[PDB]
Each structure stands twice: as C-alpha cells, then as structure tokens.
Amino acid sequence: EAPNQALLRILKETEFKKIKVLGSGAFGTVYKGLWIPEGEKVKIPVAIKELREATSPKANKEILDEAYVMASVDNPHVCRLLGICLTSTVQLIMQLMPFGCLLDYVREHKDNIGSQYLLNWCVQIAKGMNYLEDRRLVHRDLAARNVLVKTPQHVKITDFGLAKLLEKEYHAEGGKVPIKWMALESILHRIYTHQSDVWSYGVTVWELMTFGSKPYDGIPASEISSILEKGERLPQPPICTIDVYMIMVKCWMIDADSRPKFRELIIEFSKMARDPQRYLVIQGDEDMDDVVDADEYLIP
C-alpha cells in the first residue's frame, strides 16, 4: 500500500527503427530494433513487441497490464519497460536481450556450459525473484523460457503477462496455464504465493541442470496433479550432486511454508558458486559510436 510512482514513458513511432524479427507466435511479434531518444544523442538497442496485428479490445488490455508491471520494477535481475508507443497497434519497447531466452541458450550451448555459469544463473534468478517478493509481486509463470540473457554472465527475469501484484494469495479463472511448472496448491486450488513461485524456481533450476529437458516429457498435463499427490517428483539430473538436487526437492514440498525462501536460495547457490566443481560434475569444466545499453540509460 505504498503509492506506485513509476513513470510510464510514451514513445513516438519516429524515435525507433525496427531492424529484424526475433520471433512471432501466441504473444504477437517481437523485433530487434534501435531507439534514438529525440535530442539525446544516444542509440539504444531494443526489442519491440507488437500484437499479432490484432485490433482485439481484450488484447490491448493484456499488453497494457504487462506494461504496467514492467514499468513498476527496477532490479538488475528483472526486465524493465522502457516505453510504450500508442500506434493503432500498441507497442511495448524494452531492452534488447541479445542472446534470447535461457532455455534456448542452454540447448544451443550444452557442450560449452560450465558449473560456474549454471550456479551463477541460479543465484541471479533467486535475486530477481527475491526482488519481486520484496515488491509483493507474484510471478505466476517462472520458467527457463521466461528468463532472458543480456550476456552469458547476466540474466534477467521477464514475462509478466500472468504476473499479479498483491493479501498473501491469488485466486484465478483458469485460462491457459503452464501446468508442469506449477505448485500443487496452484493446480488443485488455483492459489498462488511467493512460495508457489519457489516450486516454479525448482523446476526452472531443473531445466538448466538438464540443459533444457522437458519436465515430465512423457506425461500428459491432466495426469500431473495425481502424480505429485502420489509423491513422485522430477529425477536427479546426471550433473547434479545430491546437495543441489536436495534443494530442488525442498522447492517441491507439499507444504509450501516448508519450502525455502528466495533469500535463502540466494545464500545456498552462492556458497555453491564459490566452489562450483564440488556441486556440479560436468565433463570438460576446464555506426554504433553512440551506442549505450539500456542499463546505462537512466532518465530521472
């Protein structure tokens, strides 16, 4: 209940160039692009999200919710909005995360990812997520596909489509949901907590440790609820020492208050990132003149 004084910045269509398409799908369309704030003498590499040319009234309501949330965050491990552009087709402008999402990155680079990288990513994500806990904000769709990569050393949490600002729970109408990342209480009772986000964290860590495997690859979504009730969980990844897998399993307790808190998760993975070969066992560990990254373009 502190007042949210974040500025929403509105961008003229003239200010930014679309260079190339990064992706299209359910979301709409994403472009690599370049932004020149007028009068400023900088050039900022950006990504631009347009809706799939939809003029739908529910669709504009959706991205403006996303815009809302993105505009209200400020953390090195969380993706922030740069601006919106109120063309007939509404556009979200954010920082360009050149290496795409982390899921695709671990897959593309399996044979070259060391323990130091994996554990540092885990730490960075726990930080992002802890920042969101401080801001009383529940992600609801944490997964490896929703973590973007600025550089291989630096990743940020994103996709706030489903993200909901809080007292101590959120209750939903189903829509579509990422069932395989969801806490049990969320599947059964449509309840979402920070601690429910921890479950999703667990599964995300698991996605990284298996270099992009699909959780429950075989199983149909309908089935999941029952399995977790039985007590089955995801398997221990080959690279994982018991110390690491233990932490994943703790994220997957039935009793959500018995799960760890992101602040604790930072600590554990930090200790592990200090001596990373003790905790993960992997074969082979061993014009642009005026360009400025978004993280150096502060405006107030």
The window from 96-104, 192-200, 248-256, 275-283 that contacts ligand 6HL (CB under 6 A) reads 96-104
3-class DSSP state of 266: helix
The window from 7-15, 41-49, 163-171, 237-245 that contacts ligand 6HL (CB under 6 A) reads 41-49
**Which DSSP string do the residues of 171-229 spell out, in sequence order?**
B---SS--GGG--HHHHHH-B--HHHHHHHHHHHHHHHHTTSPPTTTTS-HHHHHHHHH
Q: How many residues of this chain interact with ligand 6HL, rule: CB under 6 A?
A: 18
Catalytic annotation, pick one of 104, 141, 293, 295: 141
Nearest to 174 by CA among 195, 188, 160: 188
Told to check if 11 binds ligand 6HL by CB under 6 A, we report: no
Choice between 180 and 261, CB closer to ligand 6HL: 180
The window from 46-54, 122-130, 162-170, 239-247 that contacts ligand 6HL (CB under 6 A) reads 46-54
Choice between 133 and 159, CB closer to ligand 6HL: 159
Choice between 110 and 189, CB closer to ligand 6HL: 110
Told to check if 23 binds ligand 6HL by CB under 6 A, we report: yes
CA 52 to chain centre: 22
How many angstroms separate the Cα of 112 from the Cα of each of 19, 86, 101, 147, 227? 30, 42, 17, 19, 34
**Start-end of H helices in the chain:** 57-71, 102-108, 115-134, 184-189, 194-209, 221-230, 242-251, 262-274, 276-279
Asked whether the beta carbons of 93 and 83 are under 8 A apart, the reply is yes
Token pair in block for residue 40: 């400023």
Asked whether the beta carbons of 211 and 113 are under 8 A apart, the reply is yes
Other Cβ atoms less than 10 A from the Cβ of 36: the count is 15
Please report how close the Cβ of residue 95 comes to ligand 6HL at its closest, in angstroms. 6
Choice between 145 and 194, CB closer to ligand 6HL: 145
The window from 98-106, 164-172, 217-225, 226-234 that contacts ligand 6HL (CB under 6 A) reads 98-106
Told to check if 65 binds ligand 6HL by CB under 6 A, we report: no
Told to check if 97 binds ligand 6HL by CB under 6 A, we report: yes
Indicate the helix (H) or strand (E) that contains 132: helix 115-134
Selected binder of ligand 6HL within 49, 77, 80, 127 (CB under 6 A): 49
Told to check if 129 binds ligand 6HL by CB under 6 A, we report: no
Selected binder of ligand 6HL within 37, 43, 44, 47 (CB under 6 A): 47
141 catalytically annotated: yes
Told to check if 77 binds ligand 6HL by CB under 6 A, we report: no
Asked whether the beta carbons of 109 and 139 are under 8 A apart, the reply is no
3-class DSSP state of 84: strand
**Amino acid (one-letter) located at 275:** D
Choice between 215 and 260, CB closer to ligand 6HL: 215
**138-157 mask for ligand 6HL (x: CB under 6 A)?**
-------x--x---------
Whole-angstrom Cα distance, residue 253 to residue 248? 9
CA contacts within 13 A on the Cβ side of 210 = 19
Binding site residues, ligand 6HL, CB under 6 A: 22-23, 30, 47-49, 92, 94, 96-97, 100-101, 103-104, 145, 148, 158-159
Active site residues: 141
